[PDB]
Every structure is written in structure tokens, then in C-alpha cells.
Amino acid sequence: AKDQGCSRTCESQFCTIAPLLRYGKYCGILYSGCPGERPCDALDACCMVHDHCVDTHNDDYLNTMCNENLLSCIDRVSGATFPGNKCNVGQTASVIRGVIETAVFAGKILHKRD
Ligand SMILES: CCCCCCCC(=O)O
Numbered sequence: 012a013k014d015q016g017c018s019r020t021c022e023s024q025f026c027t028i029a030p031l032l033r034y035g036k037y038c039g040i041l042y043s044g045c046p047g048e049r050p051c052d053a054l055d056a057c058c059m060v061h062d063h064c065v066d067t068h069n070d071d072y073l074n075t076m077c078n079e080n081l082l083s084c085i086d087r088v089s090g091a092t093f094p095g096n097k098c099n100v101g102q103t104a105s106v107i108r109g110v111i112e113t114a115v116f117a118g119k120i121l122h123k124r125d
């Protein structure tokens with residue numbers, strides 16, 4: 012279904028462990044918000060856009076637009092975070108940023124071949 016297997020809660024788990032990170036309703040691998048769910052802060056909103064971008068490009072998590080847009084978004088994150096956020100915004104963003112940089116390169120390499 013569409014409204015099953017998704018988050019409606021602002022999480023802040025494994026803040027610095029990339030494969031297990033869950034932040035807001037959207038930030039994390041194979042972790043996303045239910046349709047219509049407002050993101051929890053600016054960083055969560057960046058992830059919301061990214062998750063849908065991948066979804067609408069044949070689940071291509073190496074789509075370079077999706078990933079480059081995420082980096083742009085991450086770099087411009089500001090304002091209040093959600094109450095009860097056990098993570099550090101800047102720290103978590105840097106962890107996401109590191110992984111996405113690698114995704115951008117991986118995407119570029121595989122598309123320079125085709
Ligand atoms: C730190 C792992 C990277 C998480 C995937 C990118 C953010 C998202 O849109 O969920």
C-alpha cells in the first residue's frame with residue numbers, strides 16, 4: 012500500500028551511523044514519510060524531496076540530479092529543528108552529505124560509460 016511502511020514520527024536515531032540513521036520522517040536509507048506528512052525541519056524537507064525524486068526516477072538512488080539537489084539543499088539548511096531531536100543538525104547533515112557525495116560520483120561514473 013501507499014500509507015503503509017512509512018513514518019509519521021520525527022525520529023532521531025543513530026545520528027552518526029550512516030546505514031542506520033533515522034532523522035525526522037524522511038532522512039535515512041529505506042526510511043520515508045507517509046504521503047502528505049510534513050517534514051520535521053529543513054534537513055528533513057531536503058530528504059523528503061530526495062526520496063520522491065528517487066521514487067519518480069525508477070527508484071534510481073544514483074540519479075545525479077536527485078543527489079546533487081540534495082547536496083545543494085543540505086548546504087542551505089537553517090532554522091529551528093523539531094522538539095525532542097536527539098541529533099545535532101549540522102553533524103547529521105555532514106554524515107548524509109558524505110554519503111551523497113559518494114553517490115554523485117558513483118552515478119557520474121556509471122553514466123560516463125553509457
Ligand atoms: C546517511 C545515509 C543517507 C540517507 C539517504 C539520503 C537522505 C534521504 O533522502 O533519506
Ligand SMILES: [Ca+2]
Nearest residue numbers: 037038039042
Ligand atoms: Ca529516506
